[PDB]
Write a protein that binds this DNA or RNA. Structure first.
Ligand SMILES: *C(=O)c1cnc2ccccc2n1
Ligand SMILES: *C(=O)c1cnc2ccccc2n1
Ligand SMILES: [Co+2]
Ligand SMILES: [Co+2]
Ligand SMILES: [Co+2]
Lengths: 10, 8
DNA sequence: AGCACGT
DNA sequence: ACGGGCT
């Protein structure tokens, strides 16, 4: 995720 | 068809 | 550690 | 038919 907690996605 | 990690 | 997608 | 991307 995020970052943090890429995206999703990317 | 989707590209969320592969995008086929 | 943290995330499910459709042409 | 297919696996990506940093705080
Ligand atoms: C894209 O729409 C799509 C749907 N199903 C799949 C299954 C397996 C590989 C790629 C796929 N892409
Ligand atoms: C991308 O690398 C990837 C891997 N697994 C998945 C599962 C479900 C939806 C999307 C996905 N993308
Ligand atoms: Co599907
Ligand atoms: Co897979
Ligand atoms: Co991966």
């Amino acid at each position: 995720t995020x970052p943090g907690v890429t995206x999703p996605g990317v | 068809x989707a590209x969320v990690x592969a995008x086929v």
